[PDB]
Write a protein that binds this ligand. Structure first.
Ligand code: CL
Ligand code: CL
Ligand code: CL
Ligand code: CL
Ligand code: CL
Ligand code: CL
Ligand code: CL
Ligand code: MG
Ligand code: ZN
Ligand code: ZN
Ligand code: ZN
Ligand code: ZN
Ligand code: ZN
Ligand code: ZN
Ligand code: ZN
Ligand code: ZN
Ligand code: ZN
Ligand code: ZN
Ligand code: ZN
Ligand code: ZN
Ligand code: ZN
Lengths: 97, 97
């Protein structure tokens, strides 16, 4: 939640420039992934080998998405003032998502 | 100047580290050059050969100073974002030193 940091107008513009500078922006849990999960779950046995293959399948896409996310967050962190960084870091310590 | 350069606090710290890292590094003794220049000017006749020797001595100090200056500016340039580099380059066109 960047919005509780009292972002300056300059910082709001800088965030826009960062988010345009790293926009993917991917959709919400691909239907294909869900359908593969569905096939594993709605079966009379749990197929662990099949499940492992399903879990691994989008590893490349996850890597690209998570790299973009982390780089974006790092860029935003670095436009913050020392006061804002302390608040961001305190908030980080309390959340688990 | 740094005119319209939106420096991150991380980059402002990096600049301080660069500028401290050049202000200490090599020696600066310039009063001797100035005193030799003074003695050429405040003399009953102009000694061209002596003046040429003073100028050549000054080239040593100029080299040291210019190398330090350019290296410092290069280090600063390389902490900048692409947007900031474009602004730095535009500003460079308007400044004289
Ligand atoms: Cl489904
Ligand atoms: Cl069956
Ligand atoms: Cl069966
Ligand atoms: Cl793989
Ligand atoms: Cl943490
Ligand atoms: Cl310069
Ligand atoms: Cl300069
Ligand atoms: Mg060096
Ligand atoms: Zn900007
Ligand atoms: Zn389904
Ligand atoms: Zn199915
Ligand atoms: Zn069966
Ligand atoms: Zn296993
Ligand atoms: Zn793998
Ligand atoms: Zn993200
Ligand atoms: Zn995150
Ligand atoms: Zn932490
Ligand atoms: Zn005299
Ligand atoms: Zn002479
Ligand atoms: Zn300089
Ligand atoms: Zn300069």
């Amino acid at each position: 939640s960047f919005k509780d940091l009292n972002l300056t107008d300059a910082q709001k513009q800088q965030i826009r420039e960062i988010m345009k500078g790293q926009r993917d922006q991917m959709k919400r849990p691909p239907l294909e992934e869900r359908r593969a999960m569905h096939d594993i779950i709605a079966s009379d046995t749990f197929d662990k080998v099949k499940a492992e293959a399903q879990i691994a399948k989008m590893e490349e896409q996850r890597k690209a998405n998570m790299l973009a996310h982390m780089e974006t967050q790092n860029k935003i962190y670095n436009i913050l003032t020392p006061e804002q960084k302390k608040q961001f870091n305190a908030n980080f310590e309390k959340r688990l998502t």
